[PDB]
């Protein structure tokens, strides 16, 4: 059978697979590949050219609708980038995970096993040129184009990924298609970006499976938003993409439909989903199980869907495949769209609760009004929809390449400015390092702020990180968890700092406050580790630039708001997982790995950069000094641990003897010797000739993480 | 909550993490350390020093039983070398994994995480110099000397591992503590080495928890025999090891033991089974009481307790089955554990009455009673091989206590006595393989049945001592016996004219020139297809002798699977691609190795009765990324083949025609959703070079797996 799980065995056990995924990238792909430099050697218009011939290049293992495979394409791209969530940037096309389990088998992905399967001999032909992630995206790209619609623009640069990203918790369901998420609609559970399991965004015969379009409109415009999309954007593109092809439900796909791709027989290679006798026969094509085209020319750019769905009255009805579907009153649209496979019949034109909920709905009512008395703003807004829901988790305008790049930098995409100025060099950098120590801020200060400016980073959507400075601005400045009078304080001394540096100048040199935030970190490092008698020079990269206010979408930064953060010993007290499991997902974002977190944690507990100022998991007696100490006490068998009486977060270390109190701690600092993996790299960092070691690793890490934007390297 | 894994969606896709864990080395310890080096630096003995002055320090939260940690630092030893087996060399001593999940919750294991927490000090002491697993075998190793009985020897060198070993099977239960592995004692599933889920070898009270010893003596024989051991060898360990210390059950732990450590609070700090309402009142296993009057000194007490006396069974104070003496005069012949002005009367398990009831078991008994030096020595060489079996070969043991004499059991291989060849030797010998009526494929298949056999479970197998030519894998099926003789034949002819045509003294072994071909033919099939590669060979392997061979222990290589070979032994009940996973995994093989390997050997075509299966390509012994290609053709369509039971047929999509023939092991390259992914990249193209260059590397990664003298 299977060799089985501690997971199993323990449900409660800490998942730090989800970290060791971070310790090496499987797959074959070289430690020195530079997809950017290969993708930048790709004609991309030679691949644009294969892609529209293929739109019409019918394969008798899944004949195209209409005779063009546009519409599949498009529905493969919507779901590939559907997934993301702002909640944690996790999910989206980035990687091309749509390919893995358990997305690969996710009911709403049905057949795009196939649509996938149509590009392999153009993957095939261009190799590493161009990822999976990237022509998945283009392919969408370019079925709307050759079907009458010139897109906004298209970015390369997604690197595909060879497994699943184990850190996306998708839910607690135990099965697809089902929810226990909302009682509600518009209710849904905080972080999901979906009310059921299994599905991109909502369920398309309606809330709970019941055609109710104004409770439908409810959860569409929560998981939208929670996409990052607003009621404009959310309409555009429903409109935008359902003007396009038609949905499939010959039959019942339950009992019409083989198992999905990860439980299909080996001889599928690959493929799920098997019609029982018929998978070529695209007169009984099934997918979702709803059926019908939702306009006249379905593989044109037109008005078909807004005007079908605005200028007619719409009645819930059962499918053929049982799946509930509107069909239009009057017979003015009986039969007036052609088979997609059939060239002597007709299909009549139908809705799905999920788009009556755009016309029901008083807000999304008003966009659709306004968009059919406007078809070229209905265009413009599609347009950078479209190009805003493929591009969004791709990071910072340096990481979209191509010649199909729009001169036009988006908001979402968190720009920063150019430096009209002259770059410091190595005499300047020990200069500011001097000062900025000689200041009255302590290296406890200069850490924590260092800290807080780049650890909002996130290699989920690389949004976040010290370039920037947005730590200084809206909302950052004012986040509990930064301590904004004290941030403020802070600040204050190093833009002084700034000032000074600037005036004193005569050759255009200047300074950003971004990058004497990370060097006041560095030098405080560097002095910590001084003061315990050992010289480190942490390496620095000059030029990070101070993005502002004009150039930032503040509601936007709330999702990179942390609830619990590990350096700073602090936890939001509301938070429902326990504190070590949101410890574990944040560290996966900073792309570090368990002994890297370890590394970390503990040595910052030696210089103390607590929230608040605290003591708790301070093992050490000499403050702001680099050494094991925090190791070397929390693993003394002479200290004995238990939870604090009236407290939330705190455990008290008594003397084992005594009874005397030594020390006080979270869970963030007691995981270290409690979790049988994290003890055992806490006993290494904890051995009497380890100490070199622990100072010259944590170093690494903390400059890893200054470092993690600075894509000037790619 | 936590994200569903995909094994919980579909319990039966493949398990590649146990491939990933080869890919990455999780711990904080440097790319380049060597353990080796470093053990070499330490001062055993003032190691063992530090370990004598322990035994004799109790500590307040786990009170030491007489004084003296001793015996539970033997159990503790013993339990981390006993979860062996020699199926497929996995569990064992080795990476001191008994620290880790599940190994370190099992029931059998409960309180010894309060042995390995008294050894902490030590730990950090000495740091690096010394592996948790060396430390742990060496704490038992004193306890025994300083209890008065001189241990065989003692070998450094077994690496820390920092989690658990994945692809063990530990069983098909669901519960801890329950067996769903046997219907009759003595026929245990295959592949097991315990009779129950979470126990070492057998339950301490009998099968399926009945007092029965002579049914217990059938599953302690084929356990231990599982393990490595024979009759004589199982009942000294046994006798041995109850020769010192107690069992102990104060209470029933059912509900008087906290969570096992996996569940217990976060405020146990690693610690688990904590005694609700500890030392006087110490329960572990729930039986209770010493073997024998002096429970920190060897003597014959364990022996002359059980033989002398007559036992009944009863239930004791923890509610679990033990034996107490029908006579009186063992009654408080004991001093109590925490208590020297007070008595206690000994017991016996089942599994201890087992000795005595089973016949063979009886007779050894005997014997060890009327010869005391008889029954020291058979214990103290078992000792050593049960917490060294895991080690490899002798150029592995490291330290000043290893013994001169080297056992049969470590696969000893002879020395090399003659010069070795060099640079122009190796390339003559080349030509002269080349040259001889040996095709590629034979090459290939001759090289990969010797140096497959390794496992990094136990570092058992591989090319060096050419045992492929002995038995008794010169007579197993994959290797296909009649054509394994014809080119071991003219090899030989190679090695025999060679060696007669020097006179500065240098020789060539067969076991080099059986690795010497497979690389000449490897770097031909690549010539073929139009690309020169040369492949690193390391001259050095010797010819090991019937001698240096214990041929029964060798079946335990025996392959059911091989993918390089297409071979499927038609009894295996797992699928075979996970039997082909499970395998990849012994030759620490990542996923991406595995499928360059598979992939480029289809190309060359070396399969078991030079069949077709999975060799796509137009021109065998042409080393191409053909296979990839081919696989991932739209335009062929797959199907299981009728009447076949591992077979499938790829015809056109388009005529039905068949155009090739295939098993499982080449067709989840192309159904996997991880290997398919892999498959592509492999398949593009401007990939075959590069496919060329990664088949080459695992080649020779492969054939140098026992060289364990250069990284
Ligand atoms: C509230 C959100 C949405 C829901 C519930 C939804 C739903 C569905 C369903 C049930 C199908 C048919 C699957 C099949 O049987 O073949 C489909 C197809 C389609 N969807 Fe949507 N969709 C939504 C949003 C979007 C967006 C945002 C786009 C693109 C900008 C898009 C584009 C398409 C296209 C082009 C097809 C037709 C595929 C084909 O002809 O094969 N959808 N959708
Ligand atoms: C059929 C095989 C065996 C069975 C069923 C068995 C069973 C047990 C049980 C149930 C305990 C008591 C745990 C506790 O309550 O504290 C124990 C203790 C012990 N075992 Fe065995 N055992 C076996 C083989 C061995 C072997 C091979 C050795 C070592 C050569 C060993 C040495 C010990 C020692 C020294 C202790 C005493 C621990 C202490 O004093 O804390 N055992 N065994
Ligand atoms: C939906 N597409
Ligand atoms: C048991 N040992």
Same mark, same amino acid.
């Given at each position: 059978?299977?060799?089985?799980s501690?997971?199993?065995?323990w449900?409660?056990?800490?998942?730090?697979?989800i970290?060791?995924?971070?310790?090496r990238? /499987? !797959?074959?792909?070289?430690?020195?590949?530079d997809?950017?430099?290969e993708?930048?050697? $790709?004609?991309?218009?030679?691949?644009?050219?294969?892609?529209?011939?293929?739109?019409?290049?019918?394969?008798?293992?899944?004949?195209?609708?209409?005779?063009?495979?546009?519409?599949?394409?498009?529905?493969?791209?919507?779901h590939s980038?559907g997934?993301?969530? #702002?909640?944690?940037?996790?999910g =989206?096309?980035?990687?091309?995970?749509?390919?893995?389990?358990?997305?690969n088998?996710?009911?709403?992905?049905?057949?795009?096993?196939?649509?996938?399967?149509?590009?392999?001999?153009?993957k095939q032909?261009?190799?590493?040129?161009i990822?999976?992630? +990237?022509?998945?995206?283009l392919? !969408?790209?370019?079925?709307?184009e050759?079907?009458?619609?010139?897109?906004?623009g298209?970015?390369? *640069?997604?690197?595909?990924a060879?497994?699943?990203?184990?850190?996306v918790?998708?839910?607690?369901?135990?099965?697809?298609e089902?929810?226990?998420?909302?009682?509600?609609?518009?209710?849904?559970?905080?972080?999901?970006? %979906?009310? /059921?399991?299994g599905?991109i965004?909502?369920?398309?015969?309606?809330?709970?499976?019941?055609?109710?379009?104004?409770?439908?409109?409810?959860?569409?415009?929560?998981?939208?938003?929670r996409?990052?999309?607003?009621?404009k954007?959310?309409?555009?593109?429903?409109?935008?993409g359902?003007?396009?092809?038609?949905?499939?439900?010959?039959?019942?796909?339950?009992?019409?439909?083989?198992?999905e791709?990860?439980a299909?027989?080996?001889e599928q290679?690959?493929?799920?989903?098997?019609?029982?006798?018929?998978?070529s026969?695209? *007169?009984?094509?099934?997918?979702?199980?709803?059926?019908?085209?939702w306009?006249?020319s379905?593989?044109?750019w037109?008005?078909?869907?807004?005007?079908?769905?605005?200028?007619?009255e719409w009645?819930?009805?059962? !499918?053929?495949?049982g799946?509930?579907?509107?069909?239009?009153?009057?017979?003015?649209l009986?039969?007036?769209?052609?088979?997609?496979?059939?060239?002597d019949?007709?299909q009549?034109?139908?809705?799905?609760?999920?788009?009556?909920a755009?016309?029901?709905?008083?807000?999304?009512?008003?966009?659709? &009004?306004?968009?059919?008395?406007?078809?070229?703003?209905? =265009?413009?807004?599609?347009?950078?929809?479209?190009?805003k829901?493929?591009?969004?988790?791709?990071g910072?305008?340096?990481?979209?390449?191509?010649?199909?790049v729009?001169?036009?930098e988006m908001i979402?995409?968190?720009?920063?400015?150019?430096?009209?100025?002259?770059?410091?060099?190595?005499?300047?950098?020990?200069?500011?390092?001097?000062?900025?120590l000689?200041?009255?801020?302590?290296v406890?200060?200069?850490?924590?702020?260092?800290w807080?400016? %780049?650890?909002?980073?996130?290699?989920? +959507?690389?949004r976040?990180g010290?370039?920037?400075?947005?730590?200084?601005?809206?909302?950052? @400045?004012?986040?509990?968890?930064?301590?904004?009078?004290?941030?403020?304080?802070?600040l204050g #001394?190093?833009?002084?700092?700034?000032?000074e540096?600037?005036?004193?100048?005569?050759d255009?040199?200047?300074?950003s406050?971004?990058?004497?935030i990370?060097?006041?970190?560095?030098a405080?490092?560097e002095?910590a580790?001084?003061?315990? *008698?050992?010289? /480190?020079?942490?390496?620095?990269?000059?030029?990070?630039v +101070?993005? *502002?206010?004009?150039?930032?979408d503040?509601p936007?930064?709330?999702?990179?708001?942390?609830?619990?953060?590990?350096?700073?010993n602090?936890?939001?007290?509301?938070?429902?997982?326990?504190? &070590?499991?949101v $410890?574990?997902d944040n560290?996966?974002?900073?792309?570090?790995t368990?002994?890297?977190l370890?590394?970390?944690?503990?040595?910052?507990?030696?210089?103390?950069?607590?929230?608040?100022?605290?003591?708790?998991?301070?093992?050490?007696?000499?403050?702001?000094?680099?050494?094991?100490?925090?190791?070397?006490n929390?693993?003394?068998?002479?200290?004995?641990?238990?939870?604090?009486?009236?407290?939330?977060h705190?455990?008290?270390?008594?003397?084992?003897d005594?009874?005397?109190?030594?020390?006080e701690?979270?869970?963030?600092? $007691?995981?270290? !010797?409690?979790?049988?993996?994290?003890?055992?790299i806490?006993? /290494?960092?904890?051995?009497?000739?380890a100490?070199? @070691?622990?100072?010259?690793d944590?170093?690494?890490?903390?400059?890893?993480?200054?470092?993690?934007d600075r894509?000037?390297?790619?």
């Amino acid at each position: 059978k299977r060799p089985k799980s501690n997971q199993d065995w323990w449900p409660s056990k800490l998942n730090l697979e989800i970290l060791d995924q971070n310790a090496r990238d /499987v !797959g074959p792909v070289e430690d020195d590949f530079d997809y950017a430099e290969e993708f930048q050697k $790709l004609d991309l218009e030679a691949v644009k050219s294969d892609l529209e011939e293929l739109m019409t290049s019918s394969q008798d293992w899944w004949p195209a609708d209409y005779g063009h495979y546009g519409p599949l394409f498009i529905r493969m791209a919507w779901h590939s980038a559907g997934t993301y969530r #702002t909640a944690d940037g996790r999910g =989206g096309a980035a990687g091309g995970r749509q390919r893995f389990a358990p997305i690969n088998s996710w009911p709403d992905n049905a057949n795009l096993d196939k649509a996938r399967r149509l590009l392999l001999p153009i993957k095939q032909k261009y190799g590493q040129k161009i990822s999976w992630a +990237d022509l998945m995206i283009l392919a !969408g790209n370019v079925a709307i184009e050759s079907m009458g619609f010139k897109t906004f623009g298209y970015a390369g *640069g997604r690197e595909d990924a060879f497994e699943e990203d184990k850190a996306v918790n998708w839910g607690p369901e135990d099965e697809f298609e089902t929810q226990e998420r909302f009682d509600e609609p518009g209710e849904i559970q905080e972080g999901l970006g %979906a009310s /059921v399991m299994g599905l991109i965004y909502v369920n398309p015969e309606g809330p709970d499976g019941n055609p109710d379009p104004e409770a439908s409109a409810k959860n569409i415009r929560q998981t939208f938003d929670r996409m990052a999309m607003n009621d404009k954007e959310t309409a555009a593109l429903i409109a935008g993409g359902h003007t396009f092809g038609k949905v499939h439900g010959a039959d019942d796909p339950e009992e019409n439909l083989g198992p999905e791709p990860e439980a299909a027989p080996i001889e599928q290679q690959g493929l799920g989903w098997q019609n029982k006798n018929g998978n070529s026969k695209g *007169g009984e094509m099934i997918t979702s199980g709803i059926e019908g085209p939702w306009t006249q020319s379905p593989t044109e750019w037109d008005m078909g869907y807004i005007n079908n769905l605005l200028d007619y009255e719409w009645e819930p009805e059962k !499918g053929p495949g049982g799946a509930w579907q509107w069909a239009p009153k009057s017979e003015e649209l009986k039969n007036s769209v052609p088979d997609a496979h059939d060239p002597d019949e007709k299909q009549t034109p139908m809705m799905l609760t999920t788009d009556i909920a755009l016309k029901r709905d008083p807000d999304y009512r008003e966009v659709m &009004e306004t968009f059919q008395e406007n078809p070229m703003e209905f =265009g413009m807004n599609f347009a950078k929809a479209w190009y805003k829901l493929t591009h969004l988790d791709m990071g910072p305008p340096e990481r979209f390449l191509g010649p199909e790049v729009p001169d036009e930098e988006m908001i979402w995409q968190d720009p920063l400015p150019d430096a009209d100025y002259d770059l410091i060099g190595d005499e300047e950098i020990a200069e500011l390092k001097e000062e900025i120590l000689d200041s009255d801020l302590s290296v406890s200060q200069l850490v924590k702020t260092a800290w807080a400016s %780049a650890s909002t980073y996130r290699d989920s +959507d690389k949004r976040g990180g010290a370039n920037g400075a947005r730590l200084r601005l809206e909302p950052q @400045k004012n986040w509990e968890v930064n301590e904004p009078e004290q941030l403020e304080t802070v600040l204050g #001394t190093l833009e002084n700092i700034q000032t000074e540096f600037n005036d004193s100048r005569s050759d255009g040199t200047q300074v950003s406050l971004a990058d004497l935030i990370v060097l006041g970190g560095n030098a405080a490092v560097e002095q910590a580790a001084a003061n315990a *008698g050992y010289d /480190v020079e942490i390496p620095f990269e000059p030029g990070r630039v +101070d993005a *502002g206010p004009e150039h930032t979408d503040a509601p936007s930064f709330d999702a990179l708001k942390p609830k619990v953060d590990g350096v700073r010993n602090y936890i939001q007290d509301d938070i429902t997982r326990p504190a &070590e499991e949101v $410890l574990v997902d944040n560290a996966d974002l900073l792309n570090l790995t368990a002994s890297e977190l370890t590394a970390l944690i503990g040595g910052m507990r030696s210089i103390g950069a607590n929230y608040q100022d605290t003591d708790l998991g301070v093992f050490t007696d000499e403050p702001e000094t680099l050494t094991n100490d925090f190791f070397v006490n929390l693993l003394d068998m002479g200290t004995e641990w238990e939870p604090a009486a009236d407290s939330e977060h705190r455990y008290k270390g008594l003397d084992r003897d005594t009874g005397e109190v030594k020390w006080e701690a979270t869970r963030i600092d $007691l995981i270290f !010797g409690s979790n049988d993996r994290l003890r055992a790299i806490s006993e /290494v960092y904890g051995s009497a000739d380890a100490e070199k @070691k622990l100072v010259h690793d944590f170093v690494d890490t903390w400059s890893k993480v200054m470092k993690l934007d600075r894509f000037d390297l790619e």
